[PDB]
């Protein structure tokens, strides 16, 4: 059976069906609208009623509220509005039929083609991976023929996200450093025949100097990898690449400087920075997206042994500078630093890193938007016009010299680990990475407090969020118009 | 005898001197540069050296390093530099002639007669009124006769910033809620007769309808007051007020969700962010700029007692909306819906409130900048702009309605006075702030972050800072013309 | 003589673990070895005519899944046993066998010096190295020495009271931390007090000297170095 997710708009006499549920209200001689009357108050935004046998072919019709019509950019939540209306209802419509185990759909593209897919696919995730209890796997198709270019690519962005919610949701003993990095390669190469991977054993990670990353290393069995993933979609071979980082922390335990108890499974998403470059990079080659893109994840596990590093310590990064160790827990930061000067080598047009690293990120802006710090407002201005689009927002942090100093403590070394102080502690880690680069155009998302769903985005369940996933593939997007 | 403050650029041959460096060296024929020549090394910004006998009126001669002659704004930090390097040059070079206890000192304009005035008089202040030990208190004069207008505005820029500081540094059992409303009503009139100070009882504040403020009040035996505040400079006396809130606790133990006791001593400085509007107010009737300007700041004591709020209890606001108080130490949030409640009364042109509000701003800016969440880009322009000239930094964060669905929590209230979760906590102290505004230009200001200084700005001696008041002067300033 | 050092270079707490605040100065935990061997490079480059021997057990303090466990039982060089109750007092233990092996030189004084317990920074807080003796004579002679200096020593209680508060029996002959929380460098003094048979030993517990931030104004804010010229300077008499 089919069932059929079908959208109106808020209050005329009669609020307004989108085309596809007028011509199903045709098609049933007036039944729809007639009972959706019957049947009780006007649907606001985000709101379903479902509806049985009004039609042979759809047993059940989802009716869902899309707000207003009128809906465009809010100039003071700096998204489009529409767009999350239209996300935010076809996922409610999906997920009642799909509660009532119907496995397939029909979506109405609601004016937004491009959106009803996100909202559906993103709405239709699960992660029962390693449950007995699955759910009935639904599959949501475009109702119609008119813009399925616009459906699929939304399929596509909304794919990328779900590939990261999946890599981040996974337990870190199933996804160990390797076993991250094949799941990456077999994405990629599926992507695109344009695509290089190399799985870089720790023989070549010492080769290359890499101090401060072997040092979070050494303290877990697990053996870590470098990831370094080739796009090269350019039909110029030579045109230098935009290059991503992402801190790739499987689990982080905190080393000796140990995390508290309480909630400590969610750091298996510390790995949420590689899990979102990657996902957009494989995002980048289905798209076919003209322009060559390098990405670097640094895979390791941050775990408390004899062997691991201690409080105190210096370590030395790749570009020779010290790097006092204070705190074992600030272990990104470290594996970031030498990740950050091997990627000056690809001569990159722009320095993207995304990494989970502060709860301070979360205390300061808590999922309401991912913060940036970057030493260009030109980067910044393109991935702000990029959240605008995908509702995925970005708000800027300050790149003050003012926390540079707090860090640049010297005592034994060059540079500290953690800032002087606790106050700012986003911003004393990001001044911290601005140590490492040289680069004009380098942006430092920090993912840390858009990690986790609850309730906060209403087209996603509660879990990890592959956050902001979508806001990478549309400025990639952008970037190679 | 006198000491003279004189400054050089950074590194040609010679470094320059200033006009009055250069002019004090031809005449003490060529000295002044031979003994800089052979003491040492070239002063960097802020670097001072101390020569003596030079010259029979000038037995000490500080000489200071300014930075960069070419300095202007620096696009990556925010601000003015070259104002940054004269504010922090003189202010060294003066504390040098204090720690000789010399009582007078001539100081060079450096190209900015107003940023030297504003280094010396912020460099020499210090709170030492209650110690036996005290200072010498030196008088800074402006060395030469060209441009005693821009010296003097500076004077009236760093005192308005003083009196906010010896206001926010006098321990709380001094500085109850009347003690403040009196310095800051005989100071006010002491700025111009075009004032008028209203120290509301009591027995006033509960005709208001009250509420919040009230409950917040009941736990301690110190009288509350509401401080009403008007500085008609408008030739037009009907001209819409600006009106500046702020809000005044004058000691927050925290109430019954009581403090920890470590440092709870800064909370004498919870009356910062009336402090800061009010001395503005003074330093804008002292600068006879033509507009009418009304100061609010509720102010009480939060006291842990027999009567005090308690945890989960349900409070009105003078718009009628009930305040679950979930948590007593957020009481500011609960003084500020009153007063910004009253606020729209005078049909005001703008609300701009401050607050020391959050632990929150802390973590998440720590002093590089003040938190200012707004409904306007307009305002958000001008308090940025009005920043980069006082050096005394801003940074906007998100009114999102993310924040809001957190704190409109039913329960048993119309709104929560703390956020479901504790994640963006200066974001939902805001959020909860919005509910009691309908102005379409409002700024809230942070303050929290910015309360004290350790050795973040260096014209600042370790204690209560009184920032952003020079902001909010600029601020008025700009408005005014 | 014979000086003896707590050599860890890094105590984590090991299975009872560090909170993670200012961990990073355990990597002075190695205090005692620093200051022991440092005055006796300093007795050779003096040519003091005495003989001395430095003993400094060097070792780091780490959890793993080979680590100590609360509670385990370890029996010393002299066939003690010795409940491991807090695996972050550890220095105990490995003075403990140290302590012992400095017997065997027949010496004339026996003084080791060790970070050993936060109990001594509440106490003193780095105006004086705490010293606990079973010898006035010692006392005397390291008292007059810090005079000197300026680098003071103080004397504190080597009492039964604190004995009979880590003699615990229960799995081993002695505990190697004190029943209550009360008079910590007392009962871990007292614990040390069991491996020595010697009529002039000196414990120096230098743990609250360890840093410097303001507190003595020729030397810069960082780790310190206190007490090794009181000890350069008793060596110095002891010579004469
Ligand atoms: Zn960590
Ligand atoms: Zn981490
Ligand atoms: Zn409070
Ligand atoms: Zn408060
Ligand atoms: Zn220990
Ligand atoms: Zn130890």
């Known amino acids: 059976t089919k069932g059929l997710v079908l959208g109106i708009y808020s209050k005329e006499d009669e609020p307004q069906f989108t085309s596809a549920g007028e011509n199903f209200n045709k098609l049933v001689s007036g039944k729809l609208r007639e009972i959706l009357n019957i049947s009780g108050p006007p649907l606001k935004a985000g709101k379903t009623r479902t509806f049985y046998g009004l039609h042979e072919d759809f047993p059940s019709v989802v009716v869902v509220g899309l707000g207003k019509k009128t809906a465009g950019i809010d100039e003071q939540e700096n998204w489009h509005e529409g767009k999350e209306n239209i996300r935010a209802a076809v996922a409610a419509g999906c997920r009642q039929i799909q509660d009532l185990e119907i496995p397939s759909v029909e979506v109405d593209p609601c004016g937004d083609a491009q959106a009803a897919a996100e909202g559906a696919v993103l709405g239709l995730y699960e992660y029962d991976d390693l449950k007995q209890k699955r759910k009935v796997v639904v599959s949501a198709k475009l109702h119609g023929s008119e813009d399925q270019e616009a459906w699929q690519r939304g399929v596509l962005f909304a794919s990328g996200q779900n590939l990261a919610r999946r890599l981040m949701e996974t337990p870190a003993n199933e996804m160990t450093p390797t076993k991250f990095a094949e799941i990456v390669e077999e994405n990629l190469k599926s992507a695109s025949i344009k695509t290089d991977v190399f799985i870089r054993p720790k023989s070549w990670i010492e080769e290359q100097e890499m101090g401060s990353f072997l040092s979070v290393a050494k303290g877990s069995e697990e053996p870590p990898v470098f990831l370094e993933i080739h796009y090269k979609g350019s039909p110029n071979a030579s045109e230098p690449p935009l290059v991503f980082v992402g801190k790739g922390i499987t689990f982080d335990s905190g080393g000796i400087s140990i995390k508290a108890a309480a909630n400590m499974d969610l750091m298996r998403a510390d790995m949420g920075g590689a899990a979102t470059i990657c996902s957009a990079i494989v995002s980048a080659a289905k798209l076919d997206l003209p322009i060559n893109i390098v990405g670097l994840a640094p895979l390791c596990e941050n775990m408390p042994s004899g062997k691991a590093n201690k409080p105190g310590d210096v370590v030395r990064a ?138 906060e985005v209403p087209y996603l369940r509660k879990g990890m969020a592959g956050r902001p996933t979508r806001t990478l593939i549309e400025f990639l997007f952008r970037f190679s118009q």
């Open 318 to 455: 790749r570009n020779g500078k010290t790097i006092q160790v204070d705190n074992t827990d600030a272990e990104g930061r470290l594996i970031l630093a030498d990740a950050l000067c091997y990627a000056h080598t690809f001569n990159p047009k722009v320095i993207i890193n995304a990494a989970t690293l502060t709860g301070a990120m979360d205390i300061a802006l808590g999922s309401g938007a991912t913060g940036v710090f970057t030493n260009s407002s030109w980067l910044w201005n393109k991935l702000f016009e990029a959240s605008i689009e995908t509702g995925d927002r970005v708000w800027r942090m300050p790149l003050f010299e003012h926390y540079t100093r707090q860090v640049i403590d010297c005592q034994l070394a060059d540079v500290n680990n953690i800032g002087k102080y606790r106050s700012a502690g986003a911003c004393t880690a990001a001044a911290f990475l601005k140590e490492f680069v040289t680069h004009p155009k380098w942006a430092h998302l920090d993912i840390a407090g858009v990690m986790t769903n609850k309730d």
